[PDB]
Ligand binder design. Sequence first.
Ligand SMILES: *[C@@H]1O[C@H](CO)[C@@H](O[C@@H]2O[C@H](CO)[C@@H](O)[C@H](O)[C@H]2NC(C)=O)[C@H](O)[C@H]1NC(C)=O
Ligand code: NAG
Lengths: 146, 224, 212
Amino acid sequence: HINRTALNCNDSLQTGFITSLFYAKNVDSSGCPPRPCDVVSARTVCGPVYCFTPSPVVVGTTDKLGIPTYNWGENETDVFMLESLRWFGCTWMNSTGFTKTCGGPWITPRCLVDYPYRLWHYPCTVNFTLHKVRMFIEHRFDAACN
Amino acid sequence: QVQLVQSGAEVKKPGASVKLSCKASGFTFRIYAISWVRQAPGQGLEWMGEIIPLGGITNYAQKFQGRVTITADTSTSTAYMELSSLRSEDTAVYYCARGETKMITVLAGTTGGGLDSWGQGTLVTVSSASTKGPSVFPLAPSSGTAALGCLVKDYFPEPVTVSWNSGALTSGVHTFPAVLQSSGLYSLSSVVTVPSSSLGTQTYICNVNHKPSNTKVDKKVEPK
Amino acid sequence: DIQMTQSPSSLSASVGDKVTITCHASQGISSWLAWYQQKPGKAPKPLIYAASSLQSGVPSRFSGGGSGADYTLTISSLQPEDFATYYCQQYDDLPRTFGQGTKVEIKRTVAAPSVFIFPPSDEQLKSGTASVVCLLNNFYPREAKVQWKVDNALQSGNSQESVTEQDSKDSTYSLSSTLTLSKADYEKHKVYACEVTHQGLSSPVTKSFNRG
Ligand SMILES: *[C@@H]1O[C@H](CO)[C@@H](O[C@@H]2O[C@H](CO)[C@@H](O)[C@H](O)[C@H]2NC(C)=O)[C@H](O)[C@H]1NC(C)=O
Ligand SMILES: *[C@@H]1O[C@H](CO)[C@@H](O)[C@H](O)[C@H]1NC(C)=O
């Protein structure tokens, strides 16, 4: 299951974004102030791809047919079929450390669905407050609002 | 599989530097944190630093931030640990250990956390002393059971092998840990207890082997 | 940083007893706590991770628990291979920090040391140094006092001690005390004595010799 993660992380801009992939760190909140979910080539992605059904769900690498691949997203035929799991949004980190999104985890402009890598992809949501949300089939997930 | 193999046991002088290597195998090198932990003689474990080979993610304990450098080399999957301005306090057993990362605590589901695999360790002695073979003096038994031994004094560096009757005598033998004298040289004593009945009939020889200096000394221990 | 303190730091038990080691952290570490077992001369063996979860291959008699800033390792009933040193280690924050370790040693009945004193060899005295050695053989518990008395003056700062680990079969300790004097100072005095006090001796045992 681990091999299904894109590891095309090259920090050519030298921002140090990769360390928060492996360690929670201390989010650097200082410096802080419309695509549909198609298919995503895997060699542009660094780390896990999270789609929200709204419940957080990890998307693994597949080929162009939906067959799981286990090459860490190295071959060009590795993709992320985001349009196969439909409010619906996805997010991930591209190779040079930018947060990519399609439609993300924002149920509202105010609240965002929590998941293990929320603060990596969105470092400016750290001071947000979490609380349980129940809503219908029922989804058990947590949200982060101002 | 999944093992860390370590070697490069080295004796260095104060001010020098030492480079320790750690060959990883049996797992995906890029993803795990290869950490380094040292244990000074008779002391506890001390975490020094870790490297995650993919991003070259290094983090060190602050005490070592101006002396240690850890490097990856993802080609051969060999983590390195370079410690410079060596001090006598850096005499220790240095361990290589594999530590899990946030990518494994999440989206792995294959158990095993913490530092779940360790290298053998390599011993690094830092001292200003020079290699020297040991002087072996006898601990002659006294005028119904008796005791005798050998004083293996003034050698550098560790270790020294001692045996009795070329290995034939093993029951009732105690070879004590070496002590570092203020001279910078180590000293050690090995003893064995015998029936005073067979004191003059049986012959007892200690076999002292200090190969750092290509020295082997065997001396017979007899009364008076 | 995060300081990790264990309790107790030494513990003496026999085979079949239940043991609990405590590990305390200066902050809450969210159950990101590991336990290792180290025997003298070998690398630490991973034992517990994430407070409760058992590392691969270790027997079921080991278990861990706790939360927040306080954790515990419990051994159901000890076995001969379980006597070793145990370390905890938090991995919630950097730097990773260990606790000082807990040494679990074998319990046994009290055994008195056989005391022996060895004069310095004539060979060594030629070199200009006298090493007088006192041997305390096969005793329990570890705590002994050797004090050196030369012409009945108590020595200080001129002796070194070395003690073996617990024996494989009789579970006892042994200790050597080395008094190191120059040839000159060695020949100024005649009576060299080694006085030993141990829990197994009703009265202190003294071994001694005169030059010659
Ligand atoms: C990762 O994402 C960033 C953000 O979109 C990309 O940077 C953009 O690159 C284009 C190239 O023409 C520029 O026009 C944009 O201005 C850039 N955006 C920002 C915010 O700087 C980057 O190219 C992507 N990297 C990869 C490897 O796909
Ligand atoms: C997963 O990645 C490792 C790392 O190279 C590789 O050895 C293995 O063959 C890959 N596939 C599977 C199914 O484990």
